[PDB]
């Protein structure tokens, strides 16, 4: 959590996946646990978001409604 903020504070970037890939790749070579949510183009959860849990409940809530009105 220290490595995400202070690396992107000097870069002044709001989200860690919005970082330039030259400055981004140093984080992967140091700490490889963040390589999984960053490398995948389409995960099931929007990465590095706190309401990403609550979005998963509401995305099912739309897919439940969207299947009703068509059927």
């Amino acid at each position: 959590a220290t490595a995400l903020t202070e690396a992107c504070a000097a870069e002044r970037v709001v989200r860690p996946h919005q970082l330039s890939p030259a400055g981004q790749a140093e984080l992967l070579l140091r700490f490889p646990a963040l390589e999984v949510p960053l490398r995948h183009p389409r995960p099931v959860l929007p990465p590095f978001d706190i309401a990403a849990e609550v979005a998963f409940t509401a995305r099912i809530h739309l897919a439940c409604l969207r299947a009703l009105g068509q059927a």
Binding site: L62, L65, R66
Partner: protein, 37 residues
Amino acid sequence: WEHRRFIVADSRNFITPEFPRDFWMSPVFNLPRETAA
């Protein structure tokens, strides 16, 4: 005893509702896969 008028119901009983023409194309039935709600 118990007395009643009586009507036999069969599966041949049906009901024919009528829809307005602009009723069927609705914003609720035509939601996209991703909404801002």
